[PDB]
Scaffold this active site. Structure first.
Site, PDB file in Angstrom:
ATOM      1  N   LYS A  23       0.845  -1.203   0.000  1.00 23.23           N
ATOM      2  CA  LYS A  23       0.000   0.000   0.000  1.00 23.23           C
ATOM      3  C   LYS A  23       0.879   1.251   0.000  1.00 23.23           C
ATOM      4  O   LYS A  23       0.667   2.167  -0.788  1.00 23.23           O
ATOM      5  CB  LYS A  23      -0.908   0.011   1.238  1.00 23.23           C
ATOM      6  CG  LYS A  23      -1.465   1.368   1.650  1.00 23.23           C
ATOM      7  CD  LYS A  23      -1.848   1.344   3.119  1.00 23.23           C
ATOM      8  CE  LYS A  23      -2.563   2.610   3.548  1.00 23.23           C
ATOM      9  NZ  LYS A  23      -1.578   3.573   4.108  1.00 23.23           N
ATOM     10  N   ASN A  24       1.898   1.259   0.858  1.00 26.83           N
ATOM     11  CA  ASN A  24       2.714   2.455   1.040  1.00 26.83           C
ATOM     12  C   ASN A  24       3.751   2.688  -0.071  1.00 26.83           C
ATOM     13  O   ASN A  24       4.466   3.674  -0.034  1.00 26.83           O
ATOM     14  CB  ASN A  24       3.314   2.510   2.456  1.00 26.83           C
ATOM     15  CG  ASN A  24       2.252   2.717   3.535  1.00 26.83           C
ATOM     16  OD1 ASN A  24       1.095   3.043   3.231  1.00 26.83           O
ATOM     17  ND2 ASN A  24       2.639   2.545   4.804  1.00 26.83           N
ATOM     18  N   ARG A  92      -5.105  11.171   3.690  1.00 25.00           N
ATOM     19  CA  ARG A  92      -4.146  12.265   3.743  1.00 25.00           C
ATOM     20  C   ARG A  92      -2.982  12.086   2.762  1.00 25.00           C
ATOM     21  O   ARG A  92      -2.304  13.048   2.443  1.00 25.00           O
ATOM     22  CB  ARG A  92      -3.682  12.540   5.179  1.00 25.00           C
ATOM     23  CG  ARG A  92      -3.151  11.335   5.929  1.00 25.00           C
ATOM     24  CD  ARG A  92      -2.642  11.714   7.316  1.00 25.00           C
ATOM     25  NE  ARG A  92      -1.430  12.540   7.227  1.00 25.00           N
ATOM     26  CZ  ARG A  92      -1.275  13.747   7.777  1.00 25.00           C
ATOM     27  NH1 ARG A  92      -2.241  14.310   8.507  1.00 25.00           N
ATOM     28  NH2 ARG A  92      -0.114  14.393   7.610  1.00 25.00           N
ATOM     29  N   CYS A 116      -5.273  14.033  13.391  1.00 24.50           N
ATOM     30  CA  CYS A 116      -5.295  12.567  13.411  1.00 24.50           C
ATOM     31  C   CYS A 116      -5.006  12.116  14.821  1.00 24.50           C
ATOM     32  O   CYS A 116      -4.098  12.635  15.481  1.00 24.50           O
ATOM     33  CB  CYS A 116      -4.199  12.073  12.478  1.00 24.50           C
ATOM     34  SG  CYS A 116      -4.197  10.306  12.341  1.00 24.50           S
ATOM     35  N   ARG A 121       0.659  15.365  13.080  1.00 23.68           N
ATOM     36  CA  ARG A 121       1.153  14.976  11.751  1.00 23.68           C
ATOM     37  C   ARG A 121       1.253  16.177  10.785  1.00 23.68           C
ATOM     38  O   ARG A 121       0.626  16.169   9.710  1.00 23.68           O
ATOM     39  CB  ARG A 121       0.305  13.824  11.168  1.00 23.68           C
ATOM     40  CG  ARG A 121       0.296  12.558  12.048  1.00 23.68           C
ATOM     41  CD  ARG A 121      -0.403  11.380  11.386  1.00 23.68           C
ATOM     42  NE  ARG A 121       0.288  10.864  10.205  1.00 23.68           N
ATOM     43  CZ  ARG A 121      -0.196   9.889   9.433  1.00 23.68           C
ATOM     44  NH1 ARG A 121      -1.369   9.334   9.731  1.00 23.68           N
ATOM     45  NH2 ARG A 121       0.495   9.433   8.385  1.00 23.68           N
ATOM     46  N   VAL A 164       8.954   9.937   5.843  1.00 23.41           N
ATOM     47  CA  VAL A 164       8.724   9.108   4.663  1.00 23.41           C
ATOM     48  C   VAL A 164       8.019   9.931   3.587  1.00 23.41           C
ATOM     49  O   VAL A 164       8.503  10.025   2.447  1.00 23.41           O
ATOM     50  CB  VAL A 164       7.842   7.897   5.017  1.00 23.41           C
ATOM     51  CG1 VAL A 164       7.431   7.150   3.764  1.00 23.41           C
ATOM     52  CG2 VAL A 164       8.560   6.984   6.022  1.00 23.41           C
ATOM     53  N   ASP A 306       4.226   0.743  11.880  1.00 16.88           N
ATOM     54  CA  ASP A 306       3.073   0.040  11.287  1.00 16.88           C
ATOM     55  C   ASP A 306       2.875  -1.399  11.789  1.00 16.88           C
ATOM     56  O   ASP A 306       1.809  -1.987  11.568  1.00 16.88           O
ATOM     57  CB  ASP A 306       3.138   0.062   9.756  1.00 16.88           C
ATOM     58  CG  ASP A 306       2.627   1.378   9.165  1.00 16.88           C
ATOM     59  OD1 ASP A 306       2.092   2.214   9.920  1.00 16.88           O
ATOM     60  OD2 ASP A 306       2.785   1.590   7.956  1.00 16.88           O
ATOM     61  N   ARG A 398      -8.897   0.073   3.875  1.00 14.95           N
ATOM     62  CA  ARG A 398      -7.984   1.091   3.396  1.00 14.95           C
ATOM     63  C   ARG A 398      -6.585   0.510   3.213  1.00 14.95           C
ATOM     64  O   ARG A 398      -5.869   0.891   2.278  1.00 14.95           O
ATOM     65  CB  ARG A 398      -7.962   2.276   4.358  1.00 14.95           C
ATOM     66  CG  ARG A 398      -9.212   3.138   4.289  1.00 14.95           C
ATOM     67  CD  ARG A 398      -9.032   4.449   5.044  1.00 14.95           C
ATOM     68  NE  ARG A 398      -7.835   5.148   4.577  1.00 14.95           N
ATOM     69  CZ  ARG A 398      -7.246   6.151   5.215  1.00 14.95           C
ATOM     70  NH1 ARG A 398      -7.730   6.583   6.376  1.00 14.95           N
ATOM     71  NH2 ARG A 398      -6.157   6.703   4.691  1.00 14.95           N
TER      72      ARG A 398
END
Ligand SMILES: CC(=O)N[C@H]1[C@@H](OP(=O)(O)OP(=O)(O)OC[C@H]2O[C@@H](n3ccc(=O)[nH]c3=O)[C@H](O)[C@@H]2O)O[C@H](CO)[C@@H](O)[C@@H]1O
Ligand SMILES: *[C@H](C)[C@H](O)P(=O)(O)O
Length: 419
Positions: A23-24, A92, A116, A121, A164, A306, A398
């Site tokens: 996903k990232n 986001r 958040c 963030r 990141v 994560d 998501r």
């Protein structure tokens, strides 16, 4: 509002899972395709609602998009330059549209993300990164509006902090600037490496990815090409933990050990038998005692934020106390009060959670609030006595491609229920 209804068991989760693309990595690569003037094919793309939201932004801005195994982007026709309030509030990661738009077309607007729960963030580093590349940026009616007259200019950029997202923003934008960008204190995440590999497949000149210093030599235009997204190391970790906390054995296929050495070492510390192959990782917990570990989240290649919720669960179930310190998102402990509803024991002190022992979990109604908190709640439901209902599972969708299908194949009893 979909829910997960789970029937818990003491039988181990065992068998095989096939890991999806990250996903990232998929998300930034899709935003980076805004740079591309010729057709792009992105393979191994997970089916996630964030991928859907990204495709819907891409289409809104004027790119032609379609998917199945791959995602196909023709960004030649992009003719709008705003990421609306409605879209940014749903994800986001849409902030990533700002860089390519300004660098390719000299103009871009993105709504400024709101609060958040997991911690502060801000996107100050993204903004300051683009300013150093020659962008004039203002905040107007909640919108980050950037402008440049002509092209962005290569600059030596020393990032205040490891990020990141901000690394992706300046790296991607730097691909179209005149001259050379040197991004110092860059994030070294595999998805940064994968994005840079994608930018190179499309005609960019990015070197140093995976190191603390990325060098980008800008070009006038990017073309198109092909790129297969790297495996999801966090989905990998999540299933390995599923096996460990349930006392089972699993082979994760289409993944690679080099993406999660920190998680693997901790799973061994926790008493698991971890083996790896060319593109698989297996964990065996059968006949083995689960011991608690101490974890400190930090940027890659250290243990990832994560995976932190998933390891909170592991420590909760393992024998011993286990200290988890969160240095990335200092308030990412929303799963703990939910796990405590299932009879988990832990204390929270600041950014440190101290995981106690429990005799076992007991099914209850619990609420998903963020991607990884949810995944840990689903896993707990699989190992609890009785029925757990995880509400608001759109959070999980998501970030995971049909997690309930993959868990079912490992022997879980989990039903997706509608309203
Ligand atoms: C869509 C995506 O790829 N998301 C991942 C990405 O998010 P994301 O890219 O937002 O995370 P960052 O690495 O940028 O954030 C790290 C820390 O730096 C701070 N910060 C960041 C930018 C900035 O301009 N100013 C600032 O102060 C953040 O508040 C956070 O405390 O990396 C995180 C850290 O591995 C992961 O948890 C997310 O799953
Ligand atoms: C910060 C807002 C969290 O990541 P989300 O799950 O609400 O997007």
């Amino acid at each position: 509002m979909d829910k997960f209804r789970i029937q818990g068991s003491d039988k181990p989760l065992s068998g095989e899972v096939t890991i999806s693309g990250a996903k990232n990595a998929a998300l930034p690569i899709l935003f980076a395709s805004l740079l591309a003037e010729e057709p792009v094919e992105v393979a191994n793309v997970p089916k996630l609602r964030d991928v859907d939201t990204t495709m819907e932004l891409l289409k809104r801005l004027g790119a032609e998009v379609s998917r199945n195994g791959s995602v196909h982007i023709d960004a030649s026709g992009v003719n709008d330059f705003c990421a609306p309030y409605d879209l940014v509030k749903t994800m986001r990661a849409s902030i990533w549209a700002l860089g390519p738009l300004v660098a390719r077309f000299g103009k871009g607007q993105v709504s400024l993300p709101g609060g958040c729960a997991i911690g502060a963030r801000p996107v100050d580093l993204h903004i300051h990164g683009l300013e150093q590349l020659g962008a004039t940026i203002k905040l107007e009616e909640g919108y980050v509006k950037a402008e440049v007259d002509g092209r962005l200019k290569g600059a030596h950029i020393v990032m205040d902090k490891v990020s990141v997202g901000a690394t992706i923003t300046v790296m991607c934008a730097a691909t179209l600037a005149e001259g050379t960008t040197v991004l110092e204190n860059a994030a070294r995440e595999p998805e940064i490496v994968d994005t840079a590999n994608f930018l190179n497949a499309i005609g960019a000149k990015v070197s140093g990815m995976g190191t603390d210093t990325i060098t980008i030599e800008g070009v006038e235009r990017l073309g198109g090409g092909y790129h297969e997204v790297v495996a999801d190391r966090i989905e990998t970790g999540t299933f390995l933990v599923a096996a460990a906390v349930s006392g089972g054995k699993i082979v994760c296929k289409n993944t690679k050990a080099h993406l999660l050495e920190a998680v693997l070492a901790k799973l061994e510390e926790a008493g698991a038998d971890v083996q790896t192959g060319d593109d698989w990782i297996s964990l065996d917990m059968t006949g083995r005692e689960l011991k608690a570990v101490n974890i400190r989240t930090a940027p890659h290649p250290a243990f990832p934020t994560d995976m932190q919720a998933q390891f909170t669960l592991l420590n909760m179930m393992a024998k011993g106390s286990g200290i988890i310190t969160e240095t990335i998102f200092e308030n990412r402990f929303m799963h703990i009060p939910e796990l405590q509803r299932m009879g988990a024991h832990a204390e929270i002190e600041g950014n440190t959670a101290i995981c106690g022992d429990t005799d076992g979990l007991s099914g209850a109604q619990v609420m998903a609030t963020d991607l990884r908190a949810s995944a840990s709640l689903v896993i707990a439901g699989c190992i609890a006595k009785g029925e757990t209902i995880v509400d608001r599972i759109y959070h999980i969708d998501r970030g995971y491609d049909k997690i309930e299908d993959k868990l079912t194949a490992l022997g879980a009893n989990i039903e997706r229920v509608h309203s």
